[model samples]
Target: QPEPDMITIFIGTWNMGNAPPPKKITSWFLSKGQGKTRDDSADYIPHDIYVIGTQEDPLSEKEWLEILKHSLQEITSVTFKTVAIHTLWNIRIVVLAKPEHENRISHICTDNVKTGIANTLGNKGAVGVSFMFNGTSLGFVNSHLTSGSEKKLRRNQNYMNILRFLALGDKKLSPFNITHRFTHLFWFGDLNYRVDLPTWEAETIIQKIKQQQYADLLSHDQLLTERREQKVFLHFEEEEITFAPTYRFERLTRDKYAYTKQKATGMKYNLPSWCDRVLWKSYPLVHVVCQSYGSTSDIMTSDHSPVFATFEAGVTSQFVSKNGPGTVDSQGQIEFLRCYATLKTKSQTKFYLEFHSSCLESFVKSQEGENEEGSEGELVVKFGETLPKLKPIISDPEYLLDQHILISIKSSDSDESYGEGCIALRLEATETQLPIYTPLTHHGELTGHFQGEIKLQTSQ
Candidate 1:
């Protein structure tokens, strides 16, 4: 396969005690791959993007490094690379690259706080490191903002300082022309903002950045309307299947005192929330899919599940068709229209056919009562009712402009065995939708088989 022109990023934060007990220290590394079924290849898996916290703690850093090395060995698909930056409380910012592009790795500058900001807070906090990708030279910043309200403001100020330093306008520094070099920028981390709450204050800060022409990568509007409008929050894209939850305090099961004396002092475990996020300047190359899985059993040892997104870089311009009416010859037009009509009719008839045939077949084969089959047929009928009312637009010259189609399919099986497929056919009819072409046309299946058993097993 060709080298990946895209990049996937994973960001996480783990709080390690300054003086952790030996068990906790061991837990930091050994516990990461704990809950899941063990695989010999686990240790070698390298993440395309990895951002972690608590590098200031000596033991924590040590554990993180070990885990990083293991991932490099186990996950051989991608290159392994890293960039580390440190904050005041010994918090360290670390970025890891996929193994495939490890040699392409380079580090820029770390965060620098202005003197005025430093004096005001009396605490030195370093914003995370920023790296530029090769082709698009997209800038990615990973940071851990302060937890409390007062400190959060300071954290935002520190973030601004880092941005200013990179822009190369500090009093004592030479200006770096990152703005001219990189067109896209992504700033993501544990912002600790409650996006669901109406009174949350971080929205104002986000708005301020928007006014400066920096767009939030994780647009709440997009998340709500485009992604989660009809689906539950739990259903995520394929790449996000392995992600862990970022929050961990609330899921503890046993008695608090039994685990630690600190719990006896009224310390309560907090529920997990989607505090960790990914943001970008221009629209993301790929949509933000979903938060990672909750509960760090074995694959993830940290309390916070990592947030990740997959992006296709370089292809910034939308797809356009260069074909015209002349592109589709008279013969081609006749063939296209016939195929389109056949597919449309078949799609419309799917409900009746499947309801009468498959439902009855399965019912009779299982010796299940007609009531069960009727219920199943009802679902098929409902889906048929919901299929797109596809009406082909006559090939217009203007319609040849670049566009994307949205398709959705619903499955009634408990295992979620729905199948959906889409093909982008350019206005230039030279681009055949099928892989095969012959003088005597032979049609091929346009969709793949349903794999619900596999999905159910994997999800379970």
Candidate 2:
């Protein structure tokens, strides 16, 4: 049975425009205060982790932290503490976790990069934090990219600089890039990419926005264009944007944009872009499902409204024991849900299989140690239907038949077998509804991860 180890994370990003923290910021943390009707949804689901990223932030880190801690206190009883926080001039990233997970987090580290003029100023830059949770390494980068409607390439350069300069792991061996060191990573903040339309088209776009018709507007979004072209954020993934753009709002107002016509000064419109965004990536071992993605309009203190997303991130549980070469128990058979593998090399690899049922010793004695070949690479492992049942090969009569399954990834070189990773699964009291990722280890060092489920045959 899989234990309850998945974490619910709430991520929020905003460009504060140098504004002070607002007094009634509870709506930012609690979804119930967002004026949702009872029919819209149930009570707000509590979060186990909170990550806040801000750009153009003038307030000190202490002030921001205090306001956030107090806001969380006012909303729920789940107490949270700062796991890591870092500031790079106007850019800041803060990570908070519940008390129950405090001990599970380790190797906390922070790094920052300056992408301002001459690469010495702090006006535009990024701040990052990384840590190990359970067995998974997670990273977060918050940035304020170069701003201007025509500076899309400059923002892309800023992103590359953060990836090259920011080192999250040990420096003695080599500069560990954020992408290679962490199992899951998030990059978010005021990306500053703008709408592709000209200023004259602002009125029409605003009409579409008011009518909640964002399809045409989003088609010309610069960030989407760059991502589509592979100019930035290579492997990151973002949820579909159903909400309106979250930038260039009128200060201290919820429903108005900073678009107007002053006769003497001509027309003034900021083009209302999705400046604040959250994007994430994960290795095949971890699975991240986004629950909600939206913008909070009620607590409007800055020109850019805060964008928020909630996710249920799956991680490997340390309590689950890894398996070795032989069968984990004397007897087993399982309904295979699915499987995942991260290979270090392109060498040929296959799944190691063990089966359990009534025909025990005779099958083992007749085989003479020969076994059938398992599924190979590129075939991968994805199964929606239950696998065929197979009997156990017990060498001794003392062994009893039971429902357990052992699947391991193995590579062969000149008849020598190398165990990449193994997972021993069995039918528990209740079936596991969700698949979990477990580390695949070789000689106690982690090579990759595997995700699958073990369950009993319901018809039996």
Candidate 3:
């Protein structure tokens, strides 16, 4: 078989300020996956990595991480695992990954840069994470630069600060210090830059934007101007601005750009600007895709609308671990060779196991402490959950049908069967007891990390 070499990555960024996280983060998330806000994307394949960023976001970063965990599990229960989360002031970032590819995702590190007051203010800095994903180097940065309609120079400097300040423990992963530590880097958030055009010119351009002539004004974008001058973000590239501006919206309707707002007797409003953005340093992989680039207006809590980018990310190579299946941490496991076996109704059934005596020995010793038995306690292989019942193999060591200690599992009757379930082992205080009303382990002992798993698959 060919080695696995590619991964799909989805990145989204929003500035929610004091507003609580939206209740339906998934809808926007899935919409972006299909590269649009339309409902036809119901069949979009879930990405392998989810990189989410928030600015002026308020919440316990870890608490929100749990919400990410439970919420994804509630929906794509088999699709995600909360990998990492961090914050620099009110700016926050979190990563979620598909569990199937969980073992290949590792070496997570997060750091932030302070661009406000003695580098102490969290509101004007970046929070980001870097990791070696599927053997490819990558970094995701979320930042909120100096905010204002006129501070283009400062915003450019803030861009420089993000490229320089945030550093991981590994010097090799420091974004600025190492030229290619990460081949693919995503830098996004509320940049707060405006068209370099004067208010009158910008207002006239806004009219042009409505007429579908906004492309002409992009040359006046402060980020684009400075990027061209090599003043900031030397190699960074952003998708063309085909979508409407994403910032300075009304905190009330968010249906359109904020008119400088109605006054005591007059009216003035900020020029519409696509301030929320996603930009990349390089396309390091063999293939890349840019599905959609735009602002989402479904949310009105923040003055800035969220922006999303969904695409496929390719890796040159991927690691295949020697360890058996998913993420087994046990020194030994019950390799229940086959989980399913075809059977004739009303006939006998059987199964086999590759057991390690010592693994179960520890389990019993922890639960069945002292008293009657001299040294060893009791343990047995058991069946589990929404499935068929075994013919009650109740025994206390030594009596079995074979010499190799290979136990057998038989159903109670042909009429007995189950749809879904598992097979596990159980250890107890009393060896001869049948389903003790109270398990001693549940009541007292068996406290430490004394359990193991069945190793029949690969890459945990």
Off by over 4 Å in 3: 1-3, 32-44, 66-79, 116-122, 169-179, 201-206, 259-269, 283-285, 318-460
Q: Please give, for residues 270-321, the per-residue lDDT of candidate 1 as tens digits.
A: 3223445554433212333322322233223333433444333431221123
- Models ranked on lDDT: 2, 3, 1
Q: List the residue pairs that clash in candidate 3.
A: 259-269, 260-268, 260-269, 325-457, 325-458, 325-460, 326-459, 326-460, 327-460
lDDT of 2 by residue, 89-134 (tens): 7789999988778878888989999985665465888999888787
Q: Give the per-residue lDDT digits (tens) of candidate 3, residues 1-460.
A: 4535567677888888568766656555654321244345543466688788888787787767766666566555555777788887788899888877667666788888888566435458888888866555678888888865667788877766666566752462211231233546788888877776676565676677667676777877777887777666654678777766766676756555664546721454457776778887543223556655666656667877778776566564442233322333233222322122222223223222122111122111011111121123322223222122221121212211100111122233331221111122332221222221111111111211111222221112
Against the hidden true structure, what lDDT does model 3 obtain?
0.54
Q: Point out the higher-scoring one by TM-score: 2 or 3.
A: 2
RMSD in angstroms, candidate 1? Answer: 19.9
| Candidate number achieving the greatest lDDT relative to the actual structure | 2
Ranking under TM-score, best-scoring first? Answer: 2, 3, 1
* Candidate number achieving the greatest TM-score relative to the actual structure: 2
Residue 417's lDDT within candidate 3 is 20
Clash counts for the predictions, in order: 35, 3, 9
